[PDB]
Structures are given as structure tokens and as C-alpha cells.
A paper describes a structure:
One such adaptor, B-cell adaptor for phosphoinositide 3-kinase (BCAP),4 functions in linking the B-cell receptor (BCR) and the co-receptor CD19 to the activation of PI3K via interaction with the SH2 domains on the regulatory p85 subunit. Architecturally, BCAP contains well defined ankyrin repeats and a Dof/BANK/BCAP (DBB) domain; the latter was first reported in the Drosophila protein Dof, where it is required for FGF-dependent signaling, and a homologous domain exists in the B-cell scaffold with ankyrin repeat (BANK) protein.
The N-terminal domain of BCAP comprising residues 7–142 was solubly expressed in Escherichia coli. The structure was solved at 2.5 Å using data derived from protein crystals in which the lysine residues were dimethylated and single-wavelength anomalous dispersion phasing with 5-amino-2,4,6-triiodoisophthalic acid monohydrate. There was a single molecule in the asymmetric unit, and the structure reveals that the N-terminal region adopts a typical TIR domain fold. The TIR domain of BCAP is composed of five parallel β-strands (βA–βE) surrounded by five α-helices(αA–αE). The loop regions, with the exception of the biologically important BB-loop, which connects the βB-strand to the αB-helix, were well defined in the electron density, and unlike the structure of the MAL-TIR domain, there are no disulfide bonds. The electrostatic potential of the solvent-accessible surface of BCAP reveals distinct regions of negative and positive potential in addition to hydrophobic patches, suggesting that the TIR domain of BCAP may interact with diverse TIR domain-containing proteins. The isolated TIR domain of BCAP is monomeric both in the crystal and in solution, a feature shared with most non-plant TIR domains, suggesting that vertebrate TIR domain-containing proteins require other domains to promote self-oligomerization: leucine-rich repeats (LRRs) for the TLR, a death domain for MyD88, and the DBB domain and likely the ANK repeats for BCAP.
Author numbering: 6 to 139
Write the structure that this text describes.
Amino acid sequence: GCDILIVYSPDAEEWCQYLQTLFLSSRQVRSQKILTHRLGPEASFSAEDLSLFLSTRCVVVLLSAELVQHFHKPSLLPLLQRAFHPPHRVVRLLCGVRDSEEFLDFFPDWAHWQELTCDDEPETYVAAVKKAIS
């Protein structure tokens, strides 16, 4: 590991615990190292942390309102571009944020991520991180 990294902000806390339990329940990914990193506003990342961002095999981005606010911090954005790459390794879950063309200004390969919604079947969630680590 790290194999699967769930990046989220505190407003999407429960979505994060939901996916953890689902991923640990499922045969395709239960066996993998599944870590989480909560973004803001209490902190930036520790040495051992920003490591994980760059080192993980697959990233799952919980797209909440509080999370995209971090896309607007220029000290931080360049790290996120290098972390959320390459696009076939990135999954986003829309958490009360409508998808948009503006995101292409922050992440140029945005359109090539795997996208999930709040009303997707659980099998869809797991198939996406299965496809992303494989």
C-alpha cells in the first residue's frame, strides 16, 4: 500500500465512512490497503501524509463543497494536480456538487475521471475502484 486513498472534507465525512465499510466488505478490494485523508481546515499535511497523496495507486475524490474550496488555494492546487493523476487512476464521487466545465481549469484531464453519484448502486462504486487499481 497505499492502494486506495479516499480524499474528503469533513462535510462528506459519512460518505467516507460508508465507502470504507463497503470497500472492506467487498471481495475485489477488501484485501487492499485503504487509507483516508481528511482535507482542512485544521491542517495541512504531515511528512507521512503528503507522501500518501503521491504514492497511492488509486485516488477516490469525494467532491463536496468544502473540498472544492481547497481547489482555490494556490499553495495547494499544484499538489492536487500531481496527486490526481493519471486520469484512469482517479475516481470522483459527486457529493452535493453538480459536475461542471469550470473544473477543467483546475484539472485538465477532469473529463477522463471515472465519475460516481450518490444514487449509484454499491456494485457500481466497487467496480469503479476495482477498474482503477487494475
